[PDB]
Design a protein around this ligand. Structure first.
Ligand code: HEM
Ligand code: LZZ
Length: 463
């Protein structure tokens, strides 16, 4: 009796369980690195930090490419911009300029911009005293203005419906960009009839039309004696072309990525820490104690307070470990014939870092499935530590995040201002938010409500 012919084999079931975790599970069988082939494309998944730091750092330039995806093409306006552009003159140029712009708010100091919008955020939420609300949108508004000031030196006022329009096409872009992660085993979208690409083009069209109208209005405003924002930095470079790479679409797409990344990432991480704090009241209680002691109510928190508020800075680290924004980063591509752990990797191969596997490695983390911000503190709780090298929430090397400083500062200040001023409790109904998560291009959390009430200690300190 003979064996059946085999036309295809996948090591696990599609769309059953999270991809990043199904891949992780395979390591028990095949080791920390292995490959899968879909027609001609070969994809390599790396799930150990040593191999990962070879791919991202030690051989950064070799693997600095991006694979091409049909969905990403629409969003990146055919591989322009930064995040989804292939390695090349255009990618490198815009990344540099973008990084350069952040210099223009170094001691309109970035810390002062952020706290400005947080103050407005906290006054809004104070009116909701005693009510249970979703805080998604108010935070969305806060960070949107920050990124807008950096890009245009403009900010939207409360109730500007352009804010709701932006919220609408961002949710639509994220929803259709990918069912789960950007890492699909099976290219379902080229197989069955679907409106996926149609829908995406419509959300993206609206977004693009909105970014063109800001550009056309700003060409009148642009003056070379003033370089104060990202859009100035980019138009200046165009005019110093005595050029193909600084076309209107190249600039537009780049702003697109920055606007997108600066909002959806930080909002999602803010929602994640609160979710974790409702589930872990002991940690939250100690956070109140901490901030009461080292900051009090004489003033509002500042970047200098990271030195004193260690349990908070540690909490944020633990959330980025447990629920990374990109649990498989963005996929990488081999620009040349190269190797990994002395295994051959041909040019054009897709390389995916399983960051989830790095952050949940039993041999690198104690009880890695548990929320324990303490793990990033010494036993005394007197200074921060780095208990594992297997930790890359922001990536590493040529393709590493470029908003990490901004990112880290926003999260710290938002969480500090809120804890100073607000009791944040479970709503009158007994539900807690599910921590299971939703894997999109971003690792999202199901929307949930939190009862917000102004702190008694905040009121009294006004008398
Ligand atoms: C908690 C917040 C954030 C996290 C965890 C995060 C994480 C990451 C990761 C993992 C990558 C790429 C990984 C890789 O491909 O190796 C990335 C890329 C990138 N991020 Fe962030 N990010 C955050 C916030 C931001 C912010 C605030 C900005 C503001 C501009 C930003 C802009 C970008 C850009 C433009 C890239 C792509 C750069 C390139 O491909 O060369 N991100 N981020
Ligand atoms: C976390 C991360 O890798 C990123 O920050 C890099 C590029 C970000 C990307 C940039 C642009 C957009 C368009 C926006 O309307 C939706 C969010 C999205 C997809 C950002 C998601 C986070 C990305 C991938």
């Amino acid at each position: 009796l003979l064996s059946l012919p085999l036309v295809g084999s996948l090591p696990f079931l599609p769309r059953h369980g999270h991809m990043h975790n199904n891949f992780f599970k395979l390591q028990k069988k095949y080791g920390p690195i292995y490959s899968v082939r879909m027609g001609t494309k070969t994809t390599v998944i790396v799930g150990h930090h040593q191999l990962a730091k070879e791919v991202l750092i030690k051989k950064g330039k070799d693997f600095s490419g991006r694979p091409q995806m049909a969905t990403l093409d629409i969003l990146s306006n055919n591989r322009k911009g930064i995040a989804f552009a292939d390695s090349g003159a255009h990618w490198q140029l815009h990344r540099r300029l973008a990084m350069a712009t952040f210099a223009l708010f170094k001691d309109q100091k970035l810390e002062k911009i952020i706290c400005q919008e947080i103050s407005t955020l906290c006054d809004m939420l104070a009116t909701h005293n005693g009510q249970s609300i979703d805080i998604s949108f108010p935070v969305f508004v806060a960070v949107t203005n920050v990124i807008s000031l950096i890009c245009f030196n403009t900010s939207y006022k409360n109730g500007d419906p352009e804010l709701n329009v932006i919220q609408n096409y961002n949710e639509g872009i994220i929803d259709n960009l990918s069912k789960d992660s950007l890492v699909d085993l099976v290219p379902w979208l080229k197989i069955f009839p679907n409106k996926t690409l149609e829908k995406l083009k419509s959300h993206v069209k609206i977004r693009n039309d909105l970014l063109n109208k800001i550009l056309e209005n700003y060409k009148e405003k642009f003056r070379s004696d003033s370089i104060t924002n990202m859009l100035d930095t980019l138009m200046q470079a165009k005019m110093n072309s005595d050029s193909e790479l600084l076309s209107d679409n190249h600039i537009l797409t780049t702003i697109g990525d920055i606007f997108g990344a600066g909002v959806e990432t930080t909002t999602s991480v803010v929602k994640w820490t609160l979710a974790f704090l409702l589930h872990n009241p002991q940690v939250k209680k100690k956070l109140y104690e901490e901030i009461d002691q080292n900051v009090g109510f004489s003033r509002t928190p500042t970047i200098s307070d990271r030195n004193r508020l260690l349990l908070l800075e540690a909490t944020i680290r633990e959330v980025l470990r447990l629920r990374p924004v990109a649990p498989m980063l963005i996929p990488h591509k081999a620009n040349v014939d190269s190797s990994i752990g002395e295994f051959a990797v041909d040019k054009g191969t897709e390389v995916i870092i399983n960051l989830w596997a790095l952050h949940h490695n039993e041999k690198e983390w104690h009880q890695p499935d548990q929320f324990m911000p303490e793990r990033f503190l010494n036993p005394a709780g007197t200074q921060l530590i780095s208990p594992s090298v297997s930790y890359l929430p922001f990536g590493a090397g040529p393709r590493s995040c470029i908003g990490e400083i901004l990112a880290r500062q926003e999260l710290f200040l938002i969480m500090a201002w809120l804890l100073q001023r607000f009791d944040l409790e479970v709503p009158d109904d007994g539900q807690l938010p599910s921590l299971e998560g939703i894997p999109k291009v971003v690792f999202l959390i199901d929307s949930f409500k939190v009862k917000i009430k102004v702190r008694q200690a905040w009121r009294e300190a006004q008398a």
